[PDB]
Amino acid sequence: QQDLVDKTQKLMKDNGRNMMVLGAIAKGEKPYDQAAVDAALKQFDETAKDLPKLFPDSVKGLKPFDSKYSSSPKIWAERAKFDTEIADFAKAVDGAKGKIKDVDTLKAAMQPIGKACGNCHENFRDKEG
Ligand code: HEC
């Protein structure tokens, strides 16, 4: 409880930390790695296996708000759809593991996995800054 809002923030923030390389390549940096993404890849699953848990009513809004977080309170309602959303996300990576191979594919594997990325965002992520 003491440190949860962060534990989650870092967990979700890690998504980008791991995608770092996946990004550079995506943008057009470094002659790709694959092995570097491999990890950052399986990282999407794991992170998507400990995310649907650190979402108490102490870090939502209307009191538990910390004027920083960015997670609509509809995540407690759509808890179901919320999971099923981050559920496939872990399946997308599972497949990306074998799928992934090059860069041209990264964008291909980044189609589904990237779905729960922006989907889980626009669905549960009202970015305001
Ligand atoms: C649900 C199916 C998710 C997947 C898969 C990913 N994200 Fe996410 N993200 C989700 C939520 C509910 C939220 C809000 C609460 C929380 O702190 O997680 C977020 C937030 C972000 C942030 C905000 C961080 C900040 O810099 O202020 C970022 C940068 C982020 N999301 C990025 C992102 C990326 C790039 C993902 C895949 C590579 C990704 N997330 C997966 C829900 C879900």
Query: Whose CA is closest to atom 43 on ligand 1?
Result: 120
- Residue ranges of domains in the chain: 1-129
* CB contact burial 46-79 (16+ within 10 A = b; e otherwise): ebbeebbeebeeebbeeeeeeeeeebeeebeeee
| Structure tokens belonging to residue 100 | 């992934």
Query: Residue 101's Cα: distance from chain center in Å?
Result: 21
The C-alpha atoms of residue 19 and residue 17 are separated, in whole angstroms, by 5
| Structure tokens belonging to residue 48 | 């998507």
Binding residues for heme c: 12, 117, 120-121
For ligand 1, pick from 107, 121, 127, 128 the residue to mutate: most ligand atoms within 8 Å of CB: 121
Nearest one of 45, 48, 41, 43 to 98, comparing CA atoms? 41
Q: Which residues line ligand 1 (CB under 6 A)?
A: 8-9, 12-13, 15-16, 19, 48, 70-71, 75, 85-86, 89, 116-117, 120-121, 124-125
Q: Name the method of structure determination.
A: NMR
Residue with tokens 């791991």: 18
| Structure tokens belonging to residue 47 | 């992170």
Taking residue 105's Cβ as centre, other Cβ atoms within 10 Å add up to 14
The C-alpha atoms of residue 108 and residue 60 are separated, in whole angstroms, by 34
For ligand 1, pick from 15, 19, 60 the residue to mutate: most ligand atoms within 8 Å of CB: 15
Overall fold of domain 1-129: Four Helix Bundle (Hemerythrin (Met), subunit A) (1.20.120)
* Cα four-point dihedral sign 33, 46, 117, 70: negative
